[PDB]
Design a protein around this ligand. Structure first.
Ligand SMILES: O=CCCCC[C@@H]1SC[C@@H]2NC(=O)N[C@@H]21
Ligand SMILES: O=CCCCC[C@@H]1SC[C@@H]2NC(=O)N[C@@H]21
Lengths: 489, 131, 244
């Protein structure tokens, strides 16, 4: 019996129920509500009632841990929401708020249902309020499998992570017809809101998958990292890997020349456990890396610069990416580990015309507000305000480390030499820049002041990180009483 | 030779390419094990570029079985406490077009022992994998 | 395996049955401790275990007086619910009620006060609740016996249930004042067919799902395992004001 799904598969596409079956465990899905009708009675809609009413909501179970989910249905009315569709979603989110369980939704709606009038707006508003209230209480993940237009786009935005499917998905606020009507330009749906556009240009989508099957397979892996609720502790899984594994290849990663580049992944991979990195937003703002990883069987958060791309310089997009990652990680009590290599901020008129001052402050706010244990490692250099922003010791950092060839200075040697000698005799470059770099572009001064705990061999990083992260397991820090902060938007 | 054969496969090299495939193929060739060779041996046996020899049916079957065992072992790691499975039915097929769908079972009777078979209600062999 | 539940409910609507035949299969063997066994026999209350954890049982009984709510039954159920909630004990209820007991003595004795106690106890409670509607639920009795709107966790019904405002006769009378005589035969049957069935209540969203009677143990164990860590709180009060 394979009835009524032949029409769907013929278009090389899967069904909502099949997606739900693929996500959860083999036999642990219990559909909650299945016999519900729209009761519209307008515009010749009194007929063609549907039992499911276009939504599939259940409970399920992943890796032995509970979950909640819902999936849109494209065959029935195009997946449009109504006064009645939104009730099921509201009930699921409320139940997942009472119990410490997350929510995952597979969006496929074609837009609002016009035949209901303003009831669709009512349902949208209720879903928006539930998302707003419960953000930071239970993790929310959203996946977009098909078209997603109109005002329905906003609820995925408030969710913590949004993923996209490559061939047959798109998302935008207004359709290309209106764009043609007002501006006069003919742009296709994919050219407007395709997965690539949101992966590279707008920065909304947190990832892209080639197929639905791969999407489910990796969504399970992502779910294996998250904590169940706000009050539950960070999960710890058994692992045969051990902190005594030898990592001596880190002694040679940093080149002896100051103008040559290297890949920061060569430093990230040895420290964490084998094959346990899940990069977030891999194709957007490549000069910074963010993602999840495990250290001795417990999930941690990774944020590191990359001198491979644009000399590892902070920017607007990198600031937004890092700020969102830090805020989410702190909201759910996940340790943060950072690797620092920054020469400063990206210079240019477009930057000031785009508001670098606002955006660069977001990362600093996220780092200063955080109360989870932090570990910082300075590999090569840290200059100016970039050193302050990237989790400096003064921002209530727990432990800070440096490598023997690091440099921590106010600015580059040339600018310091220029400002320290206004009209000093010519040729001052040769006998002053070298001396200043020798005397003050070294971690000795910063260690004398007390800004780094110790200068360590690069081969001891795994040992030190495991020791510190084990000791810091029970830190309790609290901020002054506030209704909420006022972050620079 | 057998020693070399075995010792070639245990050389883990990561970060750059190498020619271990050529050495393996040359050693495994029955012409090399015949007893005598020549100095024009290489280009005589490699006329157009280089193309590694393929796998026989039993070798590919064994690779399938080991892949299924590894998949189950790594799957059981992620589950919490005793809420973990012990038997599945997998469908292995190499290639982008699923060439040769081979149903496989697995039972995981101990930490490093399985009961691989064709499917359910099929005779089992009880191989061993240590990884 | 519990497949004997498929046959407990008779196919006639006027025949009676023993609710213990439904209570006993779901709970673990020889684990029932009835409370007040000889008083207000139309309602059963007591303690029982489900998968090794103690729960609270409150069910109607159509054997005695057609399973009709009353003063004494209301007091008994209210006290049991209040005690069970005070100490964080899950509550499982089975519903079969045609309404309240009609009589002058009842109003002369204050049915209005006493019947409100059970409703107050059910609404104030914050422990996980599971409700199963076997055959029927009419009028305010459906509201009182842990309806889904009183912050109930999960509600289930059996395929031959009935959830309506009142009996078919009264509805037919009120919906057609002076309609042509003999209206009984071609109206009461139609109304009972169309609206005395769980399809309408399921359409509105008042029952989670319609289940086979053989899956009750599975569903109850699953829900009671999942609901182990619910945290709900009432608004700040020095204390309530229950209708004494
Ligand atoms: O010496 C002249 C140019 C030096 C730029 C050094 C890098 S580029 C972006 C960032 N902003 C700075 O002031 N320094 C760094
Ligand atoms: O049809 C006439 C008498 C119906 C009574 C039905 C039962 S008796 C007690 C309870 N109160 C009602 O109104 N209905 C039920």
């Amino acid at each position: 019996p394979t009835a009524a799904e032949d029409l769907r598969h013929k278009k090389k596409r899967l069904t909502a129920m099949e997606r739900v079956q693929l996500f959860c465990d083999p036999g642990t899905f219990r559909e909650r509500d299945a016999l519900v009708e729209h009761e519209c009675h307008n515009f010749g809609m009194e007929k063609r009632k549907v039992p499911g009413d276009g939504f599939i909501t259940g409970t399920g179970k992943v890796f032995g841990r509970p979950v909640f989910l819902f999936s849109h249905d494209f065959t029935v009315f195009g997946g449009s929401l109504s006064r009645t569709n939104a009730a099921k979603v509201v009930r699921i989110m409320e139940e997942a708020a009472k119990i410490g369980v997350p929510v995952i939704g597979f969006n496929d709606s074609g837009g609002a249902r016009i035949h209901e009038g303003v009831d669709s707006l009512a349902g949208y508003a209720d879903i928006f309020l539930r998302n707003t209230l419960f953000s930071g209480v239970i993790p929310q993940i959203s996946v977009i499998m098909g078209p997603c237009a109109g005002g329905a786009v906003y609820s995925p935005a408030i969710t913590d992570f949004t993923f996209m499917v490559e061939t047959s998905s798109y998302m935008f606020v207004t359709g290309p017809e209106v764009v043609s009507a007002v501006g006069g330009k003919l742009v296709t749906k994919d050219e407007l809101g395709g997965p690539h556009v949101h992966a590279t240009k707008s920065g909304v989508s947190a990832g892209t998958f080639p197929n639905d099957i791969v999407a489910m397979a990796q969504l399970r892996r992502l779910y294996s990292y998250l904590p169940l609720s706000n009050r539950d502790p960070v999960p710890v899984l058994p692992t045969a890997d051990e902190r005594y594994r030898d990592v001596s290849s880190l002694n040679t990663v940093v080149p002896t020349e100051v103008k040559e580049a290297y890949d920061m992944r060569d430093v990230i991979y040895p420290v964490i456990d084998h094959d346990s990195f899940f990069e977030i937003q891999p194709q957007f703002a490549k000069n910074i890396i963010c993602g999840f990883a495990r250290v001795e069987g417990r999930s941690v958060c990774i944020i590191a610069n990359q001198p491979k791309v644009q000399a590892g310089v902070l920017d607007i997009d990198s600031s937004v990416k890092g700020a969102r990652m830090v805020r989410f990680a702190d909201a759910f009590n996940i340790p943060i580990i950072t690797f620092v290599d920054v020469p400063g901020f990206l210079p240019g008129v477009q930057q000031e015309y785009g508001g670098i001052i606002r955006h660069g402050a977001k990362l600093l706010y996220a780092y200063a507000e955080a109360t989870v244990p932090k570990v910082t490692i300075i590999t090569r250099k840290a200059y100016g305000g970039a050193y302050d922003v990237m989790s400096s010791k003064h921002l209530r950092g727990d432990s800070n480390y440096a490598w023997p060839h690091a440099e921590i200075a106010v600015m580059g040697a040339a600018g310091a030499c220029k400002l320290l000698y206004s009209k000093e005799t010519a040729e001052q470059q040769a006998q002053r820049i070298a001396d200043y770099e020798k005397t003050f572009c070294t971690p000795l001064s910063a260690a004398r002041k007390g800004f780094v705990d110790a200068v360590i061999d690069p081969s001891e990083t795994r040992m030190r990180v495991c020791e510190d992260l084990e000791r810091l397991a029970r830190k309790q820090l609290q901020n002054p009483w506030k209704k909420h902060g006022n972050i620079p938007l | 030779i057998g020693r070399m054969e075995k010792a070639l496969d245990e050389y883990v090299i990561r970060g750059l390419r190498h020619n271990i495939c050529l050495l393996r193929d040359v050693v495994t060739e029955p012409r090399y094990r015949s007893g005598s060779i020549t100095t024009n041996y290489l280009q005589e046996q490699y006329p157009n570029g280089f193309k590694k020899a393929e796998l026989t049916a039993e070798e590919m079957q064994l690779m399938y079985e080991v892949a299924a065992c590894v998949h189950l072992k790594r799957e059981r790691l992620h589950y919490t406490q005793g809420t973990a499975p012990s038997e599945r039915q997998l469908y292995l097929s190499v290639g982008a077009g699923q060439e040769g769908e081979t149903p496989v079972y697995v039972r995981y009777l101990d930490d490093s022992h399985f009961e691989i078979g064709a499917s359910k209600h099929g005779p089992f062999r009880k191989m061993e994998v240590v990884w």
